[PDB]
Design a protein around this ligand. Sequence first.
Ligand SMILES: *[C@@H]1O[C@H](CO)[C@@H](O[C@@H]2O[C@H](CO)[C@@H](O[C@H]3O[C@H](CO)[C@@H](O)[C@H](O)[C@@H]3O)[C@H](O)[C@H]2NC(C)=O)[C@H](O)[C@H]1NC(C)=O
Ligand SMILES: *[C@@H]1O[C@H](CO)[C@@H](O[C@@H]2O[C@H](CO)[C@@H](O[C@H]3O[C@H](CO)[C@@H](O)[C@H](O)[C@@H]3O)[C@H](O)[C@H]2NC(C)=O)[C@H](O)[C@H]1NC(C)=O
Ligand code: IWB
Ligand SMILES: *[C@@H]1O[C@H](CO)[C@@H](O[C@@H]2O[C@H](CO)[C@@H](O)[C@H](O)[C@H]2NC(C)=O)[C@H](O)[C@H]1NC(C)=O
Ligand SMILES: *[C@@H]1O[C@H](CO)[C@@H](O[C@@H]2O[C@H](CO)[C@@H](O)[C@H](O)[C@H]2NC(C)=O)[C@H](O)[C@H]1NC(C)=O
Ligand SMILES: *[C@@H]1O[C@H](CO)[C@@H](O[C@@H]2O[C@H](CO)[C@@H](O)[C@H](O)[C@H]2NC(C)=O)[C@H](O)[C@H]1NC(C)=O
Ligand SMILES: *[C@@H]1O[C@H](CO)[C@@H](O[C@@H]2O[C@H](CO)[C@@H](O)[C@H](O)[C@H]2NC(C)=O)[C@H](O)[C@H]1NC(C)=O
Ligand SMILES: *[C@@H]1O[C@H](CO)[C@@H](O[C@@H]2O[C@H](CO)[C@@H](O)[C@H](O)[C@H]2NC(C)=O)[C@H](O)[C@H]1NC(C)=O
Ligand code: NAG
Ligand code: NAG
Ligand code: NAG
Ligand code: NAG
Ligand code: NAG
Ligand code: NAG
Ligand code: NAG
Ligand code: GLU
Lengths: 653, 510, 137
Amino acid sequence: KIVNIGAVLSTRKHEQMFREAVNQANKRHGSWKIQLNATSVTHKPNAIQMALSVCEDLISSQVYAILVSHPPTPNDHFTPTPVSYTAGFYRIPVLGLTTRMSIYSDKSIHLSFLRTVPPYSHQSSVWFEMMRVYNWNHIILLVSDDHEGRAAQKRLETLLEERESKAEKVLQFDPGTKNVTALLMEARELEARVIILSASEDDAATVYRAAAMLNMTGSGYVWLVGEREISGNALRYAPDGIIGLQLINGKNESAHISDAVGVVAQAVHELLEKENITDPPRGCVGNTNIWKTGPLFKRVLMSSKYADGVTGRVEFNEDGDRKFANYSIMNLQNRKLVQVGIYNGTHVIPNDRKIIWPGGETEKPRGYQMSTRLKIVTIHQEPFVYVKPTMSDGTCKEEFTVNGDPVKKVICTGPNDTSPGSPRHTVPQCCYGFCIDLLIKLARTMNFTYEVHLVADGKFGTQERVNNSNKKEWNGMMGELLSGQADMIVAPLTINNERAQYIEFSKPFKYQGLTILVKKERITGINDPRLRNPSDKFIYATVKQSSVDIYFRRQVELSTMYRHMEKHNYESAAEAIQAVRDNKLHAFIWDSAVLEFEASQKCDLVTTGELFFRSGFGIGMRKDSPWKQNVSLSILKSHENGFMEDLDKTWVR
Amino acid sequence: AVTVAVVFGSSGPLQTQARTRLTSQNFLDLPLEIQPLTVGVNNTNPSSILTQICGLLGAARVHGIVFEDNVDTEAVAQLLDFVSSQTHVPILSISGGSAVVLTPKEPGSAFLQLGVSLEQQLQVLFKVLEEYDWSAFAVITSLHPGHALFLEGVRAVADASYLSWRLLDVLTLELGPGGPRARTQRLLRQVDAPVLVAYCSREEAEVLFAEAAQAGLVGPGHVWLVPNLALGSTDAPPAAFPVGLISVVTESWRLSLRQKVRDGVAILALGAHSYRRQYGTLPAPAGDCRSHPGPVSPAREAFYRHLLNVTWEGRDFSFSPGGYLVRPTMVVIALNRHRLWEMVGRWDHGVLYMKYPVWPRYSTSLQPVVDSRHLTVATLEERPFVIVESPDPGTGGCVPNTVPCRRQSNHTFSSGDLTPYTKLCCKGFCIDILKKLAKVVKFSYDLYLVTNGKHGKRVRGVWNGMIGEVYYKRADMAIGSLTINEERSEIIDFSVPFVETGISVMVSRS
Amino acid sequence: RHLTVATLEERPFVIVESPDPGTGGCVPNTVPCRRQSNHTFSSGDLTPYTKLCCKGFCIDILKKLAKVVKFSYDLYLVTNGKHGKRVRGVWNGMIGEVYYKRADMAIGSLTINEERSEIIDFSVPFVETGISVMVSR
Ligand SMILES: *[C@@H]1O[C@H](CO)[C@@H](O[C@@H]2O[C@H](CO)[C@@H](O[C@H]3O[C@H](CO)[C@@H](O)[C@H](O)[C@@H]3O)[C@H](O)[C@H]2NC(C)=O)[C@H](O)[C@H]1NC(C)=O
Ligand SMILES: *[C@@H]1O[C@H](CO)[C@@H](O[C@@H]2O[C@H](CO)[C@@H](O[C@H]3O[C@H](CO)[C@@H](O)[C@H](O)[C@@H]3O)[C@H](O)[C@H]2NC(C)=O)[C@H](O)[C@H]1NC(C)=O
Ligand SMILES: COC(=O)c1ccc([C@@H]2C(C(C)=O)=C(O)C(=O)N2CCc2c(C)[nH]c3ccccc23)cc1
Ligand SMILES: *[C@@H]1O[C@H](CO)[C@@H](O[C@@H]2O[C@H](CO)[C@@H](O)[C@H](O)[C@H]2NC(C)=O)[C@H](O)[C@H]1NC(C)=O
Ligand SMILES: *[C@@H]1O[C@H](CO)[C@@H](O[C@@H]2O[C@H](CO)[C@@H](O)[C@H](O)[C@H]2NC(C)=O)[C@H](O)[C@H]1NC(C)=O
Ligand SMILES: *[C@@H]1O[C@H](CO)[C@@H](O[C@@H]2O[C@H](CO)[C@@H](O)[C@H](O)[C@H]2NC(C)=O)[C@H](O)[C@H]1NC(C)=O
Ligand SMILES: *[C@@H]1O[C@H](CO)[C@@H](O[C@@H]2O[C@H](CO)[C@@H](O)[C@H](O)[C@H]2NC(C)=O)[C@H](O)[C@H]1NC(C)=O
Ligand SMILES: *[C@@H]1O[C@H](CO)[C@@H](O[C@@H]2O[C@H](CO)[C@@H](O)[C@H](O)[C@H]2NC(C)=O)[C@H](O)[C@H]1NC(C)=O
Ligand SMILES: *[C@@H]1O[C@H](CO)[C@@H](O)[C@H](O)[C@H]1NC(C)=O
Ligand SMILES: *[C@@H]1O[C@H](CO)[C@@H](O)[C@H](O)[C@H]1NC(C)=O
Ligand SMILES: *[C@@H]1O[C@H](CO)[C@@H](O)[C@H](O)[C@H]1NC(C)=O
Ligand SMILES: *[C@@H]1O[C@H](CO)[C@@H](O)[C@H](O)[C@H]1NC(C)=O
Ligand SMILES: *[C@@H]1O[C@H](CO)[C@@H](O)[C@H](O)[C@H]1NC(C)=O
Ligand SMILES: *[C@@H]1O[C@H](CO)[C@@H](O)[C@H](O)[C@H]1NC(C)=O
Ligand SMILES: *[C@@H]1O[C@H](CO)[C@@H](O)[C@H](O)[C@H]1NC(C)=O
Ligand SMILES: N[C@@H](CCC(=O)O)C(=O)O
């Protein structure tokens, strides 16, 4: 039983190393009557003629596997593809020795393909490790629009989902296009200072020069790149201090040849010990069937641990890519690529030298640049945020408390009255109350200035699916905060599970629940028979697109009440309270604090039943906000000493 | 006068080759009468395909290529895509085998497959589930390359849908010749689901269905939905395929090979017509197997753009940037009693049209009887216990926690002359009890109202109402406000009473 | 997926009982817990660790969290301090156990304040509380 192996190499001397390696494997693994034969051909310029020569020289023989190298002249995925098709028709495994493209790891296209060197997509994983080492959470991902960039982005995002984190934003730029500065401009406006680039060498050079022109290479910024962006024309224009990484062997053709021959020999011996091995087709012409053993040979080849390689342990993952590779972390110090670590498959260990960050800093830079100007969206809630017209000269009227102390007020910008009568301009008005005083104390404590504006549509926020939409999106304050119009929500925003998935909440600054307001006390909460038996006689509803609507929608037992309420929901709390007082609405379901304050101050109305959904109000911020901890600590301290009690006495007695 | 070459590989009968050379003077209807070329590779291997295409391109200056192949060929699509990448000739893959969508194509290629993506098939199948209200299903996938894409697609479609889908389990079985037959039978013995969605190739489908039949997973109470990959040679299905198996194909599934060739050549001719009308000149022919130019010429890029959006004989052949079809007319087919693939539903303009008001389950695997975990439940309308209402005007269907009940035909006036039913939404105490039971006992049901009688009464020896439905085997069980008495208990089997009741007298206090 | 949870008895929230020697184990709705002790009261191998059974409000919350988040856990009480107090820069109690990496998380009658929140992370408050004054009439 003679076993024949084939190879497509470049220099015709690599063929001699291939023959020497096959001789070594044939002696180390007992020859007996196994006789591992070796045949080889050289790469050809024309791809079609290369495929035809693959049929005529290698497939014509009883080849069990084909090795394929990469010519020194850069042609990217062009050169190893033809073999992968011709050998892929018959399910003959083909091992790439130096190819790095991610398209060859897609087993639906390149069926019988394996590789001894990981693709570029795996450079994301090592990046992830650094994000764990230096605790970087807010990152920008600058990937090219080609398939390789998309693969890198997908791999990094999948890694981040396990950690349950997210990239700040992803910027896909068309390959080979100039003036990507516009995209970079967006990266400048973000709060993240870490940029992870995945592009070709020319695109890397373009991005480097554009970032240099925009002062993105200064202090506080961190650049993470792969080997494509720190070699060739990219290295010359690379800004100082960037961190790239290189595979240890990478371009060592001979080491990969030896390792591949070793793994192939081991797999061949195992396969012939398995019996029922049939025979390769012996010629492309005539034979139109796949090789029956092919899938079994590939399955044996993938499940192989050749822990004797020149390049270390040789093992494959679920799609043939080399698992557990070694990377060297390189830092550009004074126009020299100094090695400042090694990624040994699972961790990165710093060994020598000192990391020089792009701004010349000698200390680890944080991955964010929290601003001082804070755009704060707020809503008009009667005991928390009073909104009043300002006087003719553009300043708030001086007013003193009943105790005799000045009332702090802020200048908000809101939509004057409802939409039809509005002149459609953000008129400046005067905002004050519980939440405004809390915000003033919080800004004084945390040392940040602010500008306050009202929510455009006057809704707290919910998820809705408009017809002919590909996805649902938050409206109101939640949509404003998620879209970026606001940086922080200072309003009676209820904390619930639906909002918490997309939004970070501070520790509650006020505990309350849900209650029912009625005119003139004949309802026993939401367990009352009339509540569960709706009729046209009894009308009850809440404010549209609020926490109460979310609460009622998510309960199957309350579905009929949800339908009845939805048929008559109101636009705002004040309108529904007025409707209740005007005998137009019988019961109003809302927050305990607002409803209790309304009943106490206005009289003529009473709250009924016990609180049936206890929660609290919290300051809403974007996910993984750097100062979420500081806001929570400040709120806890305010609760502890006296501040919340003082606010309660002053505003809502 | 564009030159279009047609490649073959379906082989089959030999005299049809004469038909191939008779294709000269039959495109007279299309504008700018086409110059056809007929070449047939009769082995379909990489060397033969490459040689045939090379000889074609070097002999005559062709404008496009129409390729048809056998259903079971896997890697031909990649070879055509590679050839189109090198020689920069717009190919058209019709028929089967090479029309299975190859989503990532080479950047410079013009493959233009005449097939439908896996995500679109998944969308149509989930529309069928929504139509018949099959919320709970189990996914069975083989180790076939692309099962990860299938799982991603089912999750994406399920998430972006209104109904609260209940994916019971996902298991990645292992099929193939002989293989490890164990551990697939064990897994198929723990599949508890009324609806099963399977992804596999033809041979793996046959193995899976033999294993499932051995595991009692066919017959009534089990519904199977598969994409086109599992089917092969729709003309003759295997004996292992269960009846009622549901798949989704394109409208050209029933068309003959001649009609498919005519449609492809028409697509090429109309694209050339639009390009010539907008540019004022005929498109330049393709190159050769020789040194390839490299950068794509603006003329080649513009001809491709005009070749994408083409409409022909009403139905449009708009092509995706990925090379497959966007918004095609889709046909939901199923295997009937006679083991023939027949049309069941249509999908035009994003709107489903099904021919069956309720899904028929006429499989004959009732040897265990217990295998049929599906029930036909009769009911009536009593205001506290069963309430009926019109379906939701917005999305049709029914409101959450409201079982869809079909009023029993229109037999009130249609005396056995009309098939269709009328959809309504049923809820109430008895319906909630039935839903609880469905979950506890793990059965599926078909709720329908009664139009003959109300509750049950012996009328000259025959029974009407719900008692009549159950007695004469038209319904497996009847639920509602059905009192237990001795007269009814002598002919049917009542259950444990779940609502106390009796005779009572009501008077006006005022 | 295995979390080490620290706690201690508080009465409305954590209640400890001895399992019945007749049945060996303890009744359902009662999670097995252990004492915070090493091999020094064992005196060999008679009883290396005290096997008790814990129930209450916080234990029910923990069981629901385990069935939802899908994690496994053990449960051990605390014998060094009760709740947490920075004594000469060293923390005892549940806060000490969590801060010094001895336990993955702590549950029970653990109040959220600033000094503890600086040192460790806190979840959302699942039951409201605060300072209250009790008098006899
Ligand atoms: C790819 O990696 C190969 C091994 O990792 C490497 O082969 C090694 O080549 C070196 C010289 O470059 C040989 O060392 C020779 O010279 C040293 C110094 O005097 C002697 O100590 C040695 O005995 C020997 O004469 C190694 O023996 C040789 N190792 C092996 C296993 O081949 C290739 O050079 C690398 N190819 C590249 C980097 O392109
Ligand atoms: C949340 O509050 C934290 C405590 O107030 C605060 O940490 C403090 O951050 C400042 C930096 O602004 C540190 O000041 C040190 O660093 C600056 C700049 O490097 C130097 O110029 C100073 O001389 C000093 O060395 C404080 O030391 C640090 N305090 C503590 C206790 O660590 C956070 O920054 C706040 N979070 C925010 C604002 O998002
Ligand atoms: C075509 O059939 C369906 O689409 C379908 C959907 C849901 C249900 C019931 C149910 C209700 C309200 O009917 C549930 O809430 C629920 O969780 N069910 C699952 C019951 C069930 C299991 C777990 N395994 C099964 C195996 C066979 C048949 C049924 C089951 C039954 C059938
Ligand atoms: C063993 O491998 C050698 C290649 O080293 C094969 O010899 C080649 O045979 C083909 C076809 O007969 C010729 O076109 C080549 O010119 C030969 N190469 C050399 C260097 O002589 C040989 O056929 C193989 N033997 C077996 C039994 O497969
Ligand atoms: C590349 O893009 C940049 C940024 O969009 C262009 O620079 C702008 O060009 C517009 C003219 O359309 C002018 O407003 C200014 O010259 C630039 N404005 C800003 C805000 O940068 C540039 O013209 C583009 N083309 C190149 C660089 O060749
Ligand atoms: C990455 O490189 C390290 C060396 O820096 C490798 O570690 C050595 O590997 C050889 C090869 O088997 C062993 O003989 C040594 O004992 C290893 N040394 C140590 C300290 O572990 C490592 O194997 C390389 N990575 C991989 C995946 O092989
Ligand atoms: C509050 O913030 C202001 C400005 O944001 C700080 O004022 C300057 O902050 C920069 C930031 O490092 C310092 O370099 C300057 O020295 C500060 N100015 C002065 C006059 O000291 C201010 O220091 C902050 N207050 C704090 C941190 O307590
Ligand atoms: C099919 O698509 C092509 C490509 O968009 C259309 O060609 C365009 O025709 C308009 C005139 O109506 C020109 O303004 C564009 O420049 C053309 N595009 C290109 C890329 O050349 C063509 O009109 C479409 N066919 C139909 C029937 O609408
Ligand atoms: C970048 O920094 C230089 C340094 O002086 C400055 O002149 C230039 O205006 C900066 N570019 C900006 C702010 O866009
Ligand atoms: C090997 O092949 C023979 C004949 O093809 C067959 O009878 C036998 O079962 C096979 N052995 C296996 C599948 O283990
Ligand atoms: C705001 O609206 C009021 C209507 O109540 C109007 O009187 C006032 O002039 C408006 N303010 C503007 C337009 O600045
Ligand atoms: C779908 O949304 C559009 C958006 O304006 C609307 O015009 C159209 O009427 C909607 N179709 C419906 C509700 O059927
Ligand atoms: C059909 O296939 C045979 C191979 O057996 C080949 O010799 C013949 O040329 C083929 N026919 C045509 C028309 O190419
Ligand atoms: C019953 O429905 C059929 C089908 O639409 C209709 O033709 C017939 O008139 C209906 N009979 C009634 C409403 O009595
Ligand atoms: C064991 O527990 C005792 C308390 O009874 C303690 O003093 C001692 O340090 C502990 N030994 C350990 C943890 O090794
Ligand atoms: N659970 C409290 C102990 C008792 C109390 O202070 O009320 C704490 O955090 O320490």
